């Protein structure tokens, strides 16, 4: 449950979003929700 999400293009997520609590994971998906959800 610990994790946050941000939007932009730092992980090549042009059009979608990414999740990383320190920029170490850089895991992105199409559903911003999948960012919070699946990112865990």
From Swiss-Prot:
The keyword Cell wall biogenesis/degradation does not apply. Keywords: Allergen, Disulfide bond, Signal. Disulfide bonds join 5-35, 11-26, 18-28, 19-39. It comes from the Eukaryota. Monomer. This is Pollen allergen Amb t 5. The chain holds residues 34 to 73 of 73 of the full protein.
């Amino acid at each position: 449950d610990d994790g946050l999400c941000y939007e932009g293009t730092n992980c090549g997520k042009v059009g979608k979003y990414c999740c990383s609590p320190i920029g170490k994971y850089c895991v992105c998906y199409d559903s911003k929700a999948i960012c919070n959800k699946n990112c865990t």
